[PDB]
Amino acid sequence: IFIEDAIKYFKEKVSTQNLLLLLTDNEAWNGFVAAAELPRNEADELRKALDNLARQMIMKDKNWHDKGQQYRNWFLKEFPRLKSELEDNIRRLR
Amino acid sequence: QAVVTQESALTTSPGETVTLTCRSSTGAVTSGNFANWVQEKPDHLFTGLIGGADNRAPGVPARFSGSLIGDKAALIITGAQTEDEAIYFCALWYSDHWVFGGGTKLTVLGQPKAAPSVTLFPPSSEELQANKATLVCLISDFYPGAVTVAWKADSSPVKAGVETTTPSKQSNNKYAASSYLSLTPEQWKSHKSYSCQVTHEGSTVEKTVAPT
Amino acid sequence: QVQLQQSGAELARPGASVKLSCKASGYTFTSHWMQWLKQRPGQGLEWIGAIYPGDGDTKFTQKFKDKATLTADKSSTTAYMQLSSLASEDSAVYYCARENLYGYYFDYWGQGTTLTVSSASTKGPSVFPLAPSSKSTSGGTAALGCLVKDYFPEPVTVSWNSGALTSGVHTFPAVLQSSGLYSLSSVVTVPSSSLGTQTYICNVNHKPSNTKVDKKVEPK
Ligand SMILES: [Cl-]
Structure with missing residues (x-):
């Protein structure tokens, strides 16, 4: 019921961007589940459902597809991290 | 409020490559605008050609391709066929809505002159029994798409009661028109014949009917 | 085979309202945005809006927000467009077309509904x-x-x-x-x-x- 109720909320207030931010960062999920005082077992069932909701939103909204701008914006904001992580990887091997 | 701009018109010949373009008023056309092309053929036959700048729809010939060149979105027809004579619309996506351009009329040169077929019908007895009379002159399969129609009562010109259509491009790229002469039953049975004379590029085709 | 079958009143009075319908068949109705467009006589296509029959979400050009109302019936798989406050500029042929979800092209089209907004009497032929x-x-x-x-x-x-x-x-x-x-x-x-x-x-x-x-x- 509660989880079912929560999903109907993430569709009202939360934007797809904000939902992904919540799903992608583990610091963010904790601040969410702990602040909500959720049980751990129910927490995973919920994290599973939002992933599901996040996936249904992406299919629906071409803006989040490869050619979609929200995707390329997400990809632009993530780029500085991927670059440095790949740079560090190479130094080791090389 | 966003404005999408296409060439108003382009000409090509069979075999040649031709490029149509799409421009956005807000800036360069990017992948996020999902440049969309649809073809409009006669009798409002719309066909989706391209989605997302370069996705070619199933059933669309290979000679159509799509690309972001510029600045703009482009539709390329690599070896145009006479059957590609059509209007081409380009639409751009702006976050939460599509905007269509004004479309480009593509002409393919080299089509041969075709003289009109002319069919003329007298008033029906049913119409006559209702105290009316209409002569019907159907004009089809002519190219280029301009004709002049003249009506004759016996040998004298008739101007009153003539209603004639604008020519209309058929599916096979030639034109059709029709012309109607309204008369009284009295006027109809008082002449020996009426005629529909259609002139097309200096040549005339004539049909005649009589009260019988 | 995917088919789009349109229907609706072809004559309306000024200031009045009318609801047009588009029956979809041959695919998963909930999966694709249903487009609505118009073509006034002697002009090009104009996009009005779209609806996602999955959740009833809609999109509009600002111009049509308080004029066109988009709805969809999941069970009969028919999309509807209600037009309000009809005026002369609303006389046109109205098309519904599918936006292929991942193609993004408009692949399948309705045969169009012809709508005239007039205060004149209908006359039968x-x-x-x-x-x-x-x-x-x-x-x-x-x-x-x-x-x-x-x-x-x-x-x-x-x-x-x-x-x-x-x-x-x-x-x-x-x-x-x-x-x-x-x-x-x-x-x-x-x-x-x-x-x-x-x-x-x-x-x-x-x-x-x-x-x-x-x-x-x-x-x-
Ligand atoms: Cl004929």
């Missing part, structure tokens, strides 16, 4: 047989037809022999007369020998006046 006269019947083939006289507003649909006769059919665009009334003719070219033995029937429909007539065209 008289239908007259266009029978070829003797001098016009001496050839191998001959043209016979139907005159669809003095109606308002557009459209009229004509078919022959309830659609079983299609070869040789040519329905001509209407003339708009100075009376403000339309007329159009439909003809079919047939073997001359068949006139007077074979029955040819033109099926005329003018929905705004509920005129639906199947006229037998006799030999003259």
Whole structure:
């Protein structure tokens, strides 16, 4: 019921961007589940459902597809991290 | 409020490559605008050609391709066929809505002159029994798409009661028109014949009917 | 095969409202955005809005937000567009088309609904047989037809022999007369020998006046 109720909320207030931010960062999920005082077992069932909701939103909204701008914006904001992580990887091997 | 701009018109010949373009008023056309092309053929036959700048729809010939060149979105027809004579619309996506351009009329040169077929019908007895009379002159399969129609009562010109259509491009790229002469039953049975004379590029085709 | 079948009132009064419908079949209705477009006479396509039958979400150009209302029926898989506050600029042919979810092209289209917004009276057509006269019947083939006289507003649909006769059919665009009334003719070219033995029937429909007539065209 509660989880079912929560999903109907993430569709009202939360934007797809904000939902992904919540799903992608583990610091963010904790601040969410702990602040909500959720049980751990129910927490995973919920994290599973939002992933599901996040996936249904992406299919629906071409803006989040490869050619979609929200995707390329997400990809632009993530780029500085991927670059440095790949740079560090190479130094080791090389 | 966003404005999408296409060439108003382009000409090509069979075999040649031709490029149509799409421009956005807000800036360069990017992948996020999902440049969309649809073809409009006669009798409002719309066909989706391209989605997302370069996705070619199933059933669309290979000679159509799509690309972001510029600045703009482009539709390329690599070896145009006479059957590609059509209007081409380009639409751009702006976050939460599509905007269509004004479309480009593509002409393919080299089509041969075709003289009109002319069919003329007298008033029906049913119409006559209702105290009316209409002569019907159907004009089809002519190219280029301009004709002049003249009506004759016996040998004298008739101007009153003539209603004639604008020519209309058929599916096979030639034109059709029709012309109607309204008369009284009295006027109809008082002449020996009426005629529909259609002139097309200096040549005339004539049909005649009589009260019988 | 994916099909889009449209329906709706073809005449409305100014200031009034009308609801058009688009029945979808042949795919997963909930999975694709249903587009709505219009084409006014002598102009290009204009996009109105879209709906996602999965959750009823919609998109609009600002211009149509407080005018067009988009809804969808998941069970009958039909999308609806209600237009409000009708005006002259709303006379046009309205199309529904599918936006392929991952293609992004508009692949399948409805046949369009013709809508006239006017305060004028509907008038139904008289239908007259266009029978070829003797001098016009001496050839191998001959043209016979139907005159669809003095109606308002557009459209009229004509078919022959309830659609079983299609070869040789040519329905001509209407003339708009100075009376403000339309007329159009439909003809079919047939073997001359068949006139007077074979029955040819033109099926005329003018929905705004509920005129639906199947006229037998006799030999003259
Ligand atoms: Cl004909």
